[PDB]
Scaffold this active site. Sequence first.
Site, PDB file in Angstrom:
ATOM      1  CG  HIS A  61      81.793 102.620  44.767  1.00 39.16           C
ATOM      2  ND1 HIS A  61      82.303 102.565  46.390  1.00 39.16           N
ATOM      3  CD2 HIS A  61      81.311 103.847  45.177  1.00 39.16           C
ATOM      4  CE1 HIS A  61      82.208 102.708  47.127  1.00 39.16           C
ATOM      5  NE2 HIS A  61      81.344 103.314  46.832  1.00 39.16           N
ATOM      6  CG  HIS A  91      79.891 101.427  35.989  1.00 40.68           C
ATOM      7  ND1 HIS A  91      78.598 101.120  35.935  1.00 40.68           N
ATOM      8  CD2 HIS A  91      80.015  99.912  36.557  1.00 40.68           C
ATOM      9  CE1 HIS A  91      77.976 100.649  36.334  1.00 40.68           C
ATOM     10  NE2 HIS A  91      78.934  99.385  36.701  1.00 40.68           N
ATOM     11  CG  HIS A  93      81.656  96.166  38.063  1.00 38.49           C
ATOM     12  ND1 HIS A  93      81.652  96.463  39.069  1.00 38.49           N
ATOM     13  CD2 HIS A  93      81.288  97.041  37.339  1.00 38.49           C
ATOM     14  CE1 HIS A  93      80.358  97.189  39.119  1.00 38.49           C
ATOM     15  NE2 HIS A  93      79.967  96.906  37.450  1.00 38.49           N
ATOM     16  CD  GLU A 103      79.560  93.452  39.419  1.00 41.76           C
ATOM     17  OE1 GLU A 103      78.804  94.269  38.947  1.00 41.76           O
ATOM     18  OE2 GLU A 103      79.968  93.653  40.534  1.00 41.76           O
ATOM     19  CG  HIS A 116      78.112  96.536  34.494  1.00 46.74           C
ATOM     20  ND1 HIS A 116      77.984  96.497  35.310  1.00 46.74           N
ATOM     21  CD2 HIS A 116      78.371  95.553  33.559  1.00 46.74           C
ATOM     22  CE1 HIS A 116      78.336  94.916  35.879  1.00 46.74           C
ATOM     23  NE2 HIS A 116      78.271  94.562  34.852  1.00 46.74           N
ATOM     24  CB  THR A 195      76.173  94.609  40.419  1.00 41.20           C
ATOM     25  OG1 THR A 195      77.144  95.810  39.908  1.00 41.20           O
ATOM     26  CG2 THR A 195      75.855  93.552  39.461  1.00 41.20           C
ATOM     27  CB  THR A 196      76.892  99.071  43.859  1.00 37.78           C
ATOM     28  OG1 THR A 196      76.052 100.084  42.895  1.00 37.78           O
ATOM     29  CG2 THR A 196      78.049  98.475  43.077  1.00 37.78           C
TER      30      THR A 196
HETATM   31  O1  LIG Z   1      78.340  98.544  40.185  1.00 33.62           O
HETATM   32  C1  LIG Z   1      76.998  98.442  39.765  1.00 33.62           C
HETATM   33  N1  LIG Z   1      76.128  99.816  39.819  1.00 33.62           N
HETATM   34  C2  LIG Z   1      75.266 100.359  39.438  1.00 33.62           C
HETATM   35  C3  LIG Z   1      74.302 101.334  40.143  1.00 33.62           C
HETATM   36  C4  LIG Z   1      72.984 102.233  39.936  1.00 33.62           C
HETATM   37  C5  LIG Z   1      72.622 101.478  38.491  1.00 33.62           C
HETATM   38  F1  LIG Z   1      72.374 101.995  38.043  1.00 33.62           F
HETATM   39  C6  LIG Z   1      73.831 100.590  37.526  1.00 33.62           C
HETATM   40  C7  LIG Z   1      74.563  99.351  38.208  1.00 33.62           C
HETATM   41  S1  LIG Z   1      75.439  97.795  37.638  1.00 33.62           S
HETATM   42  O2  LIG Z   1      74.656  97.146  38.189  1.00 33.62           O
HETATM   43  O3  LIG Z   1      75.015  97.996  36.121  1.00 33.62           O
HETATM   44  N2  LIG Z   1      76.415  98.776  38.184  1.00 33.62           N
HETATM   45 ZN   LIG Z   2      78.544  97.907  36.714  1.00 32.28          ZN
END
Ligand SMILES: O=C1Nc2ccc(F)cc2S(=O)(=O)N1
Ligand SMILES: [Zn+2]
Length: 257
Positions: A61, A91, A93, A103, A116, A195-196
């Site tokens: 992802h 990571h 996006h 996002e 992020h 956000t996932t």
């Molecule tokens: O795509 C995202 N997936 C996540 C998954 C787990 C997280 F701890 C934080 C995020 S996140 O919201 O920073 N962004």
């Molecule tokens: Zn993220």
Amino acid sequence: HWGYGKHNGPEHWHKDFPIAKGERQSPVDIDTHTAKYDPSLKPLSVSYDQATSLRILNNGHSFQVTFDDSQDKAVLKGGPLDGTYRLLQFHFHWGSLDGQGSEHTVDKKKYAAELHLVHWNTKYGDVGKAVQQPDGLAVLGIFLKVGSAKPGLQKVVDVLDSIKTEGKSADFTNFDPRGLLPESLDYWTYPGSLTTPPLAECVTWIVLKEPISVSSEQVLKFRKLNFNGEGEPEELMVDNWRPAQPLKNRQIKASFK
Ligand SMILES: O=C1Nc2ccc(F)cc2S(=O)(=O)N1
Ligand SMILES: [Zn+2]
């Protein structure tokens, strides 16, 4: 099963994760004229000098860089936060084109990408427990625009060809995440979610106002990654962003006038 395609993308996630239609979902549009300066907010404390990076990996992802969080080494404190949040991973996006990829949006503007930096509240002992709490995580979000190169990103970009496909990882020690930060720590903050999937409503979002600039060559390298695994049909890893979600009964607060 979930992803970013037409048949498994964000509009489908609610079927497996009904919290997708919840009361504090992320990301959101940041309306800059409606966000109110909150003088009770404190300066952020981003203490990354002792950060210990470990691996870089393609999870199908995004790609992420992981850190040793078994001790208070790289921590986020202050701002809207109570207590100490340890850096676990970062990571990104990003988009298929420079006009999309972030996002969060700012007055409906989409940036080319969004970083992020994910941290968890040490009062809950481990990240799995933290994700079950309304104040379990703090994510520092940083916008990327395309312009000059970001020198502190190049070590990341140069290793991406080694993690092209889902499931690949590589050693990524001695990386300093301070090189990914903009000059200013002015921020907006609001209560939100991952956000996932599982879209857990456990995140204090801290979104920096100042974007970092990255070069077209740097972001092009992101766009050469693959959602698929080795020996499968190539589907380029692009547009791995969730669109803005309803703000509902939330206020976005600004750290700055
Ligand atoms: O795509 C995202 N997936 C996540 C998954 C787990 C997280 F701890 C934080 C995020 S996140 O919201 O920073 N962004
Ligand atoms: Zn993220």
